[PDB]
Homo-oligomer: A and B are copies of this chain.
Amino acid sequence: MVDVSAKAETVREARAEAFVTMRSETLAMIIDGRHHKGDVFATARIAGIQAAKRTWDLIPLCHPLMLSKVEVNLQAEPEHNRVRIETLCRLTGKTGVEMEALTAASVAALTIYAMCKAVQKDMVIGPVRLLAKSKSGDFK
C-alpha cells in the first residue's frame, strides 16, 4: 500500500451503484415483502453498512479509516425486472472512499441474492460501478 501521510485533510466522498436482475415473480415477492417480517431491503441495507466499515479487512492494500457516514438506498424497478442499489460514503481524511462505496453496494447485492436463492438460481448481479468522487471532482 502507498504512503498517505503527505497529501491530506479534506471532505472525501463517493457514490456507487449495483444491480440485481431477476424474474418478475421473484421481484414480486421482495416488494410484497417490505414492511413485513423479514424485509429483504432492510437486511441488505444493514449488511451494506457493515461491509463498508470492513473494507480495509477485505481488500489487502486498502487503508483503514473512520467513515463518518454510510448510506445504502434500495429501489425496486418492475419495469426492468431488477433492484437498484445506490450507496454513499463520506469521511474527512487523507484518502478517498471509492472502495467503501463499491464494497457496500456489492455486499448489499449479495444479500438480496442470498435471500432469493431458493426461488431463482439464475439471477445476475451487475453492473457494479462508481458515479462520483471528490483535486479529482468526478461527477455524473
Taking chain A's interface residues, is the majority helix, strand, or loop, or is none over half, making it mixed? mixed
Does the CB pair A47–B59 fall under 8 Å?
yes
The answer to whether B1 touches A49, judged by C-beta atoms less than 8 angstroms apart, is yes
Query: Quick one: copies of this chain in the complex?
Result: 6
Indicate the size class of the contact surface on chain A.
Answer: 35 or more
Smallest Cβ-Cβ distance to A117: which chain B residue = B98
CB-contact partner of A127 in B51, B115, B126, under 8 A: B126
A binding-site residues for B, Cβ under 8 Å: 1-5, 11, 19, 35-36, 39, 42-43, 46-47, 49-51, 53-54, 56-70, 90-92, 94, 98-99, 102-103, 106-107, 109-111, 113-115, 117, 121-130, 133, 138
15 contacts between A and B (CB under 8 A): A1-B70, A4-B68, A42-B42, A47-B59, A49-B60, A53-B56, A58-B107, A68-B94, A99-B113, A121-B130, A124-B128, A125-B127, A125-B129, A126-B126, A126-B127
